[PDB]
Symmetry: C4
Subunit: 42 residues, 4 copies
């Protein structure tokens, strides 16, 4: 079980890095969407 | 094991918040894609 | 443990639905990116 | 428990493939965003 737990902790860290990378992309997308809306209005 | 279970419950909540954030982004993307298609047709 | 396992199976299904939703978005994004490249070339 | 562990290992592989697919999309998005910024400046 304690091998499994160490393996789970690594997995959890990987998934939390994934969550963070998605959060970064979501912010980059929001900035793009604002730039698009500015371009399209003009 | 019950330390692990508490840790898992927290992880599950984090992942379900991630799923929700992605769902929000998917909706924002759909709206953008519609606006793009409107702009490009015109 | 078997409560945990049932809980894990539900989580796994939720995560696999999330994976599928992302795959759908990735396809929608690819189609958008092609339409953009067509618009921008013209 | 060892049925569960085998099931977890499969899940972990699925999630790590998901992470990789997202990383690929993030790169594709970055390239698109650069192309957009080039188009919009001109």
């Amino acid at each position: 079980f304690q091998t499994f737990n160490a393996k789970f902790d690594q997995f959890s860290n990987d998934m939390n890095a994934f969550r963070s990378d998605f959060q970064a992309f979501k912010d980059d997308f929001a900035r793009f969407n604002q730039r698009f809306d500015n371009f399209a209005t003009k």
